[PDB]
JSON list of C-alpha atoms in Angstrom, two decimals:
[
{"chain": "A", "resi": 1, "resn": "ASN", "atom": "CA", "xyz": [0.00, 0.00, 0.00]},
{"chain": "A", "resi": 2, "resn": "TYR", "atom": "CA", "xyz": [1.30, 3.41, -1.02]},
{"chain": "A", "resi": 3, "resn": "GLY", "atom": "CA", "xyz": [-1.25, 5.83, 0.43]},
{"chain": "A", "resi": 4, "resn": "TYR", "atom": "CA", "xyz": [-3.53, 8.31, -1.30]},
{"chain": "A", "resi": 5, "resn": "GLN", "atom": "CA", "xyz": [-2.26, 9.02, -4.81]},
{"chain": "A", "resi": 6, "resn": "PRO", "atom": "CA", "xyz": [-3.97, 11.86, -6.72]},
{"chain": "A", "resi": 7, "resn": "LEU", "atom": "CA", "xyz": [-5.31, 11.32, -10.23]},
{"chain": "A", "resi": 8, "resn": "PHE", "atom": "CA", "xyz": [-5.07, 14.67, -12.04]},
{"chain": "A", "resi": 9, "resn": "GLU", "atom": "CA", "xyz": [-2.29, 16.31, -10.02]},
{"chain": "A", "resi": 10, "resn": "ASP", "atom": "CA", "xyz": [1.11, 16.24, -11.70]},
{"chain": "A", "resi": 11, "resn": "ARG", "atom": "CA", "xyz": [3.60, 13.62, -10.57]},
{"chain": "A", "resi": 12, "resn": "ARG", "atom": "CA", "xyz": [5.68, 15.55, -8.04]},
{"chain": "A", "resi": 13, "resn": "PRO", "atom": "CA", "xyz": [7.99, 14.36, -5.26]},
{"chain": "A", "resi": 14, "resn": "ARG", "atom": "CA", "xyz": [6.11, 14.64, -1.99]},
{"chain": "A", "resi": 15, "resn": "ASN", "atom": "CA", "xyz": [7.91, 12.45, 0.55]},
{"chain": "A", "resi": 16, "resn": "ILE", "atom": "CA", "xyz": [11.45, 11.37, 1.35]},
{"chain": "A", "resi": 17, "resn": "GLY", "atom": "CA", "xyz": [12.79, 9.04, -1.32]},
{"chain": "A", "resi": 18, "resn": "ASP", "atom": "CA", "xyz": [10.83, 10.41, -4.27]},
{"chain": "A", "resi": 19, "resn": "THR", "atom": "CA", "xyz": [12.85, 11.17, -7.39]},
{"chain": "A", "resi": 20, "resn": "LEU", "atom": "CA", "xyz": [12.96, 14.43, -9.33]},
{"chain": "A", "resi": 21, "resn": "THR", "atom": "CA", "xyz": [14.67, 15.36, -12.59]},
{"chain": "A", "resi": 22, "resn": "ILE", "atom": "CA", "xyz": [16.93, 18.43, -12.60]},
{"chain": "A", "resi": 23, "resn": "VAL", "atom": "CA", "xyz": [17.82, 20.01, -15.93]},
{"chain": "A", "resi": 24, "resn": "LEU", "atom": "CA", "xyz": [21.20, 21.56, -15.21]},
{"chain": "A", "resi": 25, "resn": "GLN", "atom": "CA", "xyz": [21.35, 24.74, -17.30]},
{"chain": "A", "resi": 26, "resn": "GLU", "atom": "CA", "xyz": [23.75, 27.31, -15.86]},
{"chain": "A", "resi": 27, "resn": "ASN", "atom": "CA", "xyz": [25.03, 30.29, -17.83]},
{"chain": "A", "resi": 28, "resn": "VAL", "atom": "CA", "xyz": [26.74, 32.97, -15.74]},
{"chain": "A", "resi": 29, "resn": "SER", "atom": "CA", "xyz": [28.87, 35.67, -17.34]},
{"chain": "A", "resi": 30, "resn": "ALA", "atom": "CA", "xyz": [30.11, 38.67, -15.38]},
{"chain": "A", "resi": 31, "resn": "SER", "atom": "CA", "xyz": [32.55, 41.31, -16.56]},
{"chain": "A", "resi": 32, "resn": "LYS", "atom": "CA", "xyz": [34.02, 44.64, -15.55]},
{"chain": "A", "resi": 33, "resn": "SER", "atom": "CA", "xyz": [36.60, 47.00, -17.00]},
{"chain": "A", "resi": 34, "resn": "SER", "atom": "CA", "xyz": [37.94, 50.45, -16.27]},
{"chain": "A", "resi": 35, "resn": "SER", "atom": "CA", "xyz": [40.62, 52.89, -17.34]},
{"chain": "A", "resi": 36, "resn": "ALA", "atom": "CA", "xyz": [42.02, 56.32, -16.55]},
{"chain": "A", "resi": 37, "resn": "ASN", "atom": "CA", "xyz": [44.52, 58.61, -18.24]},
{"chain": "A", "resi": 38, "resn": "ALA", "atom": "CA", "xyz": [46.09, 62.04, -17.95]},
{"chain": "A", "resi": 39, "resn": "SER", "atom": "CA", "xyz": [48.49, 64.08, -20.05]},
{"chain": "A", "resi": 40, "resn": "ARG", "atom": "CA", "xyz": [50.10, 67.51, -19.96]},
{"chain": "A", "resi": 41, "resn": "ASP", "atom": "CA", "xyz": [52.47, 69.10, -22.48]},
{"chain": "A", "resi": 42, "resn": "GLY", "atom": "CA", "xyz": [54.08, 72.52, -22.39]},
{"chain": "A", "resi": 43, "resn": "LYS", "atom": "CA", "xyz": [56.59, 74.52, -24.42]},
{"chain": "A", "resi": 44, "resn": "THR", "atom": "CA", "xyz": [57.86, 78.06, -23.87]},
{"chain": "A", "resi": 45, "resn": "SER", "atom": "CA", "xyz": [60.31, 80.12, -25.88]},
{"chain": "A", "resi": 46, "resn": "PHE", "atom": "CA", "xyz": [61.51, 83.69, -26.29]},
{"chain": "A", "resi": 47, "resn": "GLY", "atom": "CA", "xyz": [64.31, 84.75, -28.60]},
{"chain": "A", "resi": 48, "resn": "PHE", "atom": "CA", "xyz": [65.60, 88.26, -29.28]},
{"chain": "A", "resi": 49, "resn": "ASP", "atom": "CA", "xyz": [67.36, 87.34, -32.51]},
{"chain": "A", "resi": 50, "resn": "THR", "atom": "CA", "xyz": [68.28, 90.98, -33.22]},
{"chain": "A", "resi": 51, "resn": "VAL", "atom": "CA", "xyz": [68.31, 93.19, -30.13]},
{"chain": "A", "resi": 52, "resn": "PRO", "atom": "CA", "xyz": [67.81, 96.93, -30.65]},
{"chain": "A", "resi": 53, "resn": "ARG", "atom": "CA", "xyz": [70.47, 99.11, -29.08]},
{"chain": "A", "resi": 54, "resn": "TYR", "atom": "CA", "xyz": [68.16, 100.78, -26.56]},
{"chain": "A", "resi": 55, "resn": "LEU", "atom": "CA", "xyz": [67.20, 97.31, -25.26]},
{"chain": "A", "resi": 56, "resn": "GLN", "atom": "CA", "xyz": [70.60, 95.56, -25.25]},
{"chain": "A", "resi": 57, "resn": "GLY", "atom": "CA", "xyz": [71.02, 96.04, -21.51]},
{"chain": "A", "resi": 58, "resn": "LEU", "atom": "CA", "xyz": [67.79, 94.23, -20.72]},
{"chain": "B", "resi": 1, "resn": "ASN", "atom": "CA", "xyz": [-0.37, 21.91, 7.43]},
{"chain": "B", "resi": 2, "resn": "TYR", "atom": "CA", "xyz": [0.96, 24.97, 5.63]},
{"chain": "B", "resi": 3, "resn": "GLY", "atom": "CA", "xyz": [-1.56, 27.68, 6.46]},
{"chain": "B", "resi": 4, "resn": "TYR", "atom": "CA", "xyz": [-3.81, 29.70, 4.18]},
{"chain": "B", "resi": 5, "resn": "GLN", "atom": "CA", "xyz": [-2.54, 29.54, 0.60]},
{"chain": "B", "resi": 6, "resn": "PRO", "atom": "CA", "xyz": [-4.22, 31.86, -1.93]},
{"chain": "B", "resi": 7, "resn": "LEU", "atom": "CA", "xyz": [-5.57, 30.51, -5.21]},
{"chain": "B", "resi": 8, "resn": "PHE", "atom": "CA", "xyz": [-5.29, 33.33, -7.77]},
{"chain": "B", "resi": 9, "resn": "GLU", "atom": "CA", "xyz": [-2.49, 35.37, -6.20]},
{"chain": "B", "resi": 10, "resn": "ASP", "atom": "CA", "xyz": [0.90, 34.87, -7.81]},
{"chain": "B", "resi": 11, "resn": "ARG", "atom": "CA", "xyz": [3.37, 32.57, -6.08]},
{"chain": "B", "resi": 12, "resn": "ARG", "atom": "CA", "xyz": [5.46, 35.02, -4.08]},
{"chain": "B", "resi": 13, "resn": "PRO", "atom": "CA", "xyz": [7.76, 34.51, -1.10]},
{"chain": "B", "resi": 14, "resn": "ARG", "atom": "CA", "xyz": [5.90, 35.58, 2.01]},
{"chain": "B", "resi": 15, "resn": "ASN", "atom": "CA", "xyz": [7.67, 34.04, 5.01]},
{"chain": "B", "resi": 16, "resn": "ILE", "atom": "CA", "xyz": [11.20, 33.15, 6.05]},
{"chain": "B", "resi": 17, "resn": "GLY", "atom": "CA", "xyz": [12.52, 30.23, 4.01]},
{"chain": "B", "resi": 18, "resn": "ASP", "atom": "CA", "xyz": [10.56, 30.88, 0.82]},
{"chain": "B", "resi": 19, "resn": "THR", "atom": "CA", "xyz": [12.59, 30.85, -2.39]},
{"chain": "B", "resi": 20, "resn": "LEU", "atom": "CA", "xyz": [12.74, 33.55, -5.05]},
{"chain": "B", "resi": 21, "resn": "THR", "atom": "CA", "xyz": [14.45, 33.65, -8.44]},
{"chain": "B", "resi": 22, "resn": "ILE", "atom": "CA", "xyz": [16.75, 36.61, -9.18]},
{"chain": "B", "resi": 23, "resn": "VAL", "atom": "CA", "xyz": [17.64, 37.34, -12.79]},
{"chain": "B", "resi": 24, "resn": "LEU", "atom": "CA", "xyz": [21.05, 38.98, -12.46]},
{"chain": "B", "resi": 25, "resn": "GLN", "atom": "CA", "xyz": [21.23, 41.56, -15.24]},
{"chain": "B", "resi": 26, "resn": "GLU", "atom": "CA", "xyz": [23.66, 44.37, -14.46]},
{"chain": "B", "resi": 27, "resn": "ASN", "atom": "CA", "xyz": [24.97, 46.79, -17.08]},
{"chain": "B", "resi": 28, "resn": "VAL", "atom": "CA", "xyz": [26.71, 49.87, -15.68]},
{"chain": "B", "resi": 29, "resn": "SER", "atom": "CA", "xyz": [28.86, 52.09, -17.88]},
{"chain": "B", "resi": 30, "resn": "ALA", "atom": "CA", "xyz": [30.14, 55.46, -16.69]},
{"chain": "B", "resi": 31, "resn": "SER", "atom": "CA", "xyz": [32.61, 57.71, -18.47]},
{"chain": "B", "resi": 32, "resn": "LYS", "atom": "CA", "xyz": [34.12, 61.17, -18.28]},
{"chain": "B", "resi": 33, "resn": "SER", "atom": "CA", "xyz": [36.72, 63.08, -20.25]},
{"chain": "B", "resi": 34, "resn": "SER", "atom": "CA", "xyz": [38.09, 66.60, -20.37]},
{"chain": "B", "resi": 35, "resn": "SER", "atom": "CA", "xyz": [40.80, 68.68, -21.98]},
{"chain": "B", "resi": 36, "resn": "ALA", "atom": "CA", "xyz": [42.24, 72.19, -22.02]},
{"chain": "B", "resi": 37, "resn": "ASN", "atom": "CA", "xyz": [44.76, 73.98, -24.21]},
{"chain": "B", "resi": 38, "resn": "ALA", "atom": "CA", "xyz": [46.37, 77.36, -24.75]},
{"chain": "B", "resi": 39, "resn": "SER", "atom": "CA", "xyz": [48.79, 78.81, -27.27]},
{"chain": "B", "resi": 40, "resn": "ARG", "atom": "CA", "xyz": [50.43, 82.15, -28.00]},
{"chain": "B", "resi": 41, "resn": "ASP", "atom": "CA", "xyz": [52.83, 83.06, -30.82]},
{"chain": "B", "resi": 42, "resn": "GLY", "atom": "CA", "xyz": [54.47, 86.39, -31.55]},
{"chain": "B", "resi": 43, "resn": "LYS", "atom": "CA", "xyz": [57.00, 87.82, -34.00]},
{"chain": "B", "resi": 44, "resn": "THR", "atom": "CA", "xyz": [58.30, 91.37, -34.30]},
{"chain": "B", "resi": 45, "resn": "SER", "atom": "CA", "xyz": [60.78, 92.87, -36.75]},
{"chain": "B", "resi": 46, "resn": "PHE", "atom": "CA", "xyz": [62.02, 96.22, -37.99]},
{"chain": "B", "resi": 47, "resn": "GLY", "atom": "CA", "xyz": [64.82, 96.66, -40.49]},
{"chain": "B", "resi": 48, "resn": "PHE", "atom": "CA", "xyz": [66.15, 99.90, -41.98]},
{"chain": "B", "resi": 49, "resn": "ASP", "atom": "CA", "xyz": [67.90, 98.22, -44.90]},
{"chain": "B", "resi": 50, "resn": "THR", "atom": "CA", "xyz": [68.86, 101.57, -46.46]},
{"chain": "B", "resi": 51, "resn": "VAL", "atom": "CA", "xyz": [68.92, 104.45, -43.98]},
{"chain": "B", "resi": 52, "resn": "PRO", "atom": "CA", "xyz": [68.46, 107.97, -45.39]},
{"chain": "B", "resi": 53, "resn": "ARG", "atom": "CA", "xyz": [71.13, 110.43, -44.38]},
{"chain": "B", "resi": 54, "resn": "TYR", "atom": "CA", "xyz": [68.84, 112.68, -42.33]},
{"chain": "B", "resi": 55, "resn": "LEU", "atom": "CA", "xyz": [67.85, 109.63, -40.24]},
{"chain": "B", "resi": 56, "resn": "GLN", "atom": "CA", "xyz": [71.23, 107.90, -39.81]},
{"chain": "B", "resi": 57, "resn": "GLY", "atom": "CA", "xyz": [71.66, 109.26, -36.29]},
{"chain": "B", "resi": 58, "resn": "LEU", "atom": "CA", "xyz": [68.41, 107.72, -35.10]}
]
């Protein structure tokens, strides 16, 4: 004797020892990315190629 | 016995121990960028290639 068994209810595990099918379908995909940058360029110049006479002391 | 179980309400977790499915879907993307620049160019010239006689002292 197996006890009350339903007639229209789906066949589910109910007690200890009942078997159940597991469809293993795992798909995990995690990602991360990052970046940082900095730049700085400078040029300076001053040339008195021909100095006038009133400014040759400076 | 499991207590009052609704019939048309969706199957939600209500008490401690109930299971809930989480669909992990994260998509975060932050960005920032900036720049600055400056420039300055100068030329000056004066040439008395042929100096007139009344101006040869200056």
